[PDB]
Amino acid sequence: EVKGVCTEAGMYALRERRVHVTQEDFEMAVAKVMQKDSEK
Amino acid sequence: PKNPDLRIAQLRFLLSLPEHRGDAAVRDELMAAVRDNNMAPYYEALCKSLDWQIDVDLLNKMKKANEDELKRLDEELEDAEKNLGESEIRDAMMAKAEYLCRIGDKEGALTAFRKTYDKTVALGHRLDIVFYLLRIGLFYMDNDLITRNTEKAKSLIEEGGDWDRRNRLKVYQGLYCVAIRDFKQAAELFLDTVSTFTSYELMDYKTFVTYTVYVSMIALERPDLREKVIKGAEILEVLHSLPAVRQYLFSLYECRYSVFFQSLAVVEQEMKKDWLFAPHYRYYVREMRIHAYSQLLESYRSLTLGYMAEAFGVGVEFIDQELSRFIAAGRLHCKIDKVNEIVETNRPDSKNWQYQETIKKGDLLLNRVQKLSRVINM
Amino acid sequence: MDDKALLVEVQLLESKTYHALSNLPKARAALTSARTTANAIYCPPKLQATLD
Amino acid sequence: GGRRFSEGTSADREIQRTLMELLNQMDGFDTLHRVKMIMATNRPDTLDPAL
Amino acid sequence: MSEKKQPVDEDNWDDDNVEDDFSNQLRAELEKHGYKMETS
Amino acid sequence: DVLPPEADSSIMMLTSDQKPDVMYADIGGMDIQKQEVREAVELPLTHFELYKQIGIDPPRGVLMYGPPGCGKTMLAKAVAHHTTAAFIRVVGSEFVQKYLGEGPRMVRDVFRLAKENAPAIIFIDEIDAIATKRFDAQTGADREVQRILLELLNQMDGFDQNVNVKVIMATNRADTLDPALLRPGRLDRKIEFPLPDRRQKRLIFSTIT
Amino acid sequence: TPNCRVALRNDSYTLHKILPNKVDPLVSLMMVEKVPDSTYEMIGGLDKQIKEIKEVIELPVKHPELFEALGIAQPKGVLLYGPPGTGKTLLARAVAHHTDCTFIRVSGSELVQKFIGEGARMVRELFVMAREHAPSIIFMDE
């Protein structure tokens, strides 16, 4: 799940068209992969 | 250790090259030099330094401690090979041969480094060894050996992304491109200033900011300056603490020409007293002056010479001899009239100027292959 | 407590009032807390667009 | 028709290739117009839900 | 080899062009401006 | 003599009378999967230099599955309609030729057409017809299919991240598959199609009504 | 050499010339399987387990005599356990990668089957390729 978050964190900077990965993308991702921890 | 290692060479500059300024450098450089076991790199710096004949016993206790770490390497290299973790002699001196890089000279470093390069099958230590060879190649300015391990370096980052090993590398190519007079490439390696880090070698991030603005102001034109450095918040908040540099940038962008020579004399003065810029401080401001002269002078056609002393910078005869040597230097595209007191400009095409460097490189390479052509075949 | 949807409302209300009282970075951090809070609710029927 | 299998015997594999060939041939990427299929069985118990 | 039958007896070039134009001109051009503040 | 490339009946999906005439608005209630496959396929096709520059290893091929009648064919109709790249669309139970070799050649020339042609898109349907679990080396009808899966499993590995060739694969049963097909480097994105419950369901009611 | 391709004339089938070798079926096998090759530099905080597995596997290659110094037999079986997603595959791949052993997992698949043999009525026919790559390690899943 560490790689599940940090691989995904590039999708946020990509979808807001950045070239530098920011720290709020990570905490934006932890609630999603950990939302899948909150899934079943 | 090689992380505080650049301040040593900066203070060897501060020792040697300013003639009057040679007291605090032999204070603090000795303060770091006869501690942390440094022995080898200051015997010729001791020749350039004072007598210091009392430091013989200081050399003896520290060649003794150097002998202690040497002999405990000699204590490690047999239990290290007795049970084989992963070539554990080179696992000891893959951390202590860099000590030996600091403590001893480059040789016992380099044979242990080209030695230990064959140990770690993953590049997570190899590329750090290569970083160490880059930094000692910078220290001894091994301008051929940096060309090797830059390519051997860059050949390792493509597997993985390793942007903490690629942007970190771009710091090194930036410092070499500003070490040489390659400024449009130096700012280009200094492009990001975002992924760049609170370094070991530029421990002030803001000194890195001053470096990238000093190279940017030559390296790029107005469109770039009028978008990149003027709208960057990450570049704005760090010169927000700079009183002069924020002024020195905005005196040029905001057409404040008279104070621009004052702050220009300040930054040029410190640049004259600066390591790594003292090779080219005269090269810097001779481009700054002709850059500002191009900026104001390529606006109007009939602006007179006496207009510029009060609004631009004082000295009518200074502007006289200063523009005269630049038109006479074959740049600064205008044509000054004298005994009616008016300065006239023109516009040239991109033909003969672009023709000029082509015949320069053509004659240069003709000299090259002519010379080699006589080298081979007797 | 066991509730999550009202945290979207109070953090979004802080995102109203810090920008309305001219505090940009705290509004960025509060809006980000609304993002990482809103990243755990099955139904944002109106709080989605209100966050948007 | 069949339901499916968990891959018992060597014969029914290409039979499932035949069946899925039929299914993709029904409504896969085609304006299936003017062609009407009429099917019949005794028991519909033993059929693919995809069919 | 390399005998020479004897009958008779970067780092530098861009710097050397800086010497070529500014060989001996305005070395300490620091205080002349402040000396032209009152004359100009 | 060497030849210009050539392949079988899947010539490029000729784009004039070949769109399945389906809009993105025709599919209601699939924001997660439509936006997600929008991220998965054509967003690396256009904005490739962000995947290169941030370097997040864009996916090679995609697998999509679920219960039937959940938009597996229809989503490929919509993406095939609004795409801009070349689109290659095979029916996956046609590699079982009677003659030997026509199968593996029929595998490799398609990927050669995706190579030579464009930064294109591969679609395969009913992968259950090929990728199974058990095998029997006593028929030849099974040995041929074994040689099919070896060829396509090779040709997926014959890439270099530089070509923008994407493979879309839609099936019904995930259980009757080999995970060797599902190893990373070949497949990394697996998309179930669950049932819309009420929320995405009423959108389908709005669109059909 | 046995199991080698050759060139052959067609009129009298006289042996013409020896061509390049066949690719190894174990190499094709691992090429099919595509395990995620790994190293120590991608291990997150498992160093005591690393010290255990070095004791189990790293010692009876580089020092086989060191067990004869103690008069005990060498270990042969390793059971790793813990929840999935905790480094089992990369660890077992990494150890063979650093000690240079043929990392050969088994899955019981049947695309692998044609390289082991025609039927391979046992698992034991794998041992021919195993001792043909004699410093080797066998890996298994659940």
Ligand SMILES: Nc1ncnc2c1ncn2[C@@H]1O[C@H](COP(=O)(O)OP(=O)(O)OP(=O)(O)O)[C@@H](O)[C@H]1O
């Ligand atoms: N937005 C929608 N969501 C789900 N189904 C829809 C939607 N719009 C139309 N449908 C209906 O779903 C049917 C199935 O579409 P499609 O063939 O893509 O399903 P499928 O998942 O491919 O199932 P199969 O693989 O069995 O064909 C269509 O015939 C259509 O009538």
Ligand SMILES: Nc1ncnc2c1ncn2[C@@H]1O[C@H](COP(=O)(O)OP(=O)(O)O)[C@@H](O)[C@H]1O
């Ligand atoms: N300790 C770890 N350090 C780094 N990555 C890990 C670790 N444990 C698991 N992973 C991640 O888990 C994946 C491998 O799972 P692993 O535990 O090796 O096999 P399995 O899950 O089948 O036991 C890799 O992609 C890897 O990135």
Ligand SMILES: [Mg+2]
């Ligand atoms: Mg379908």
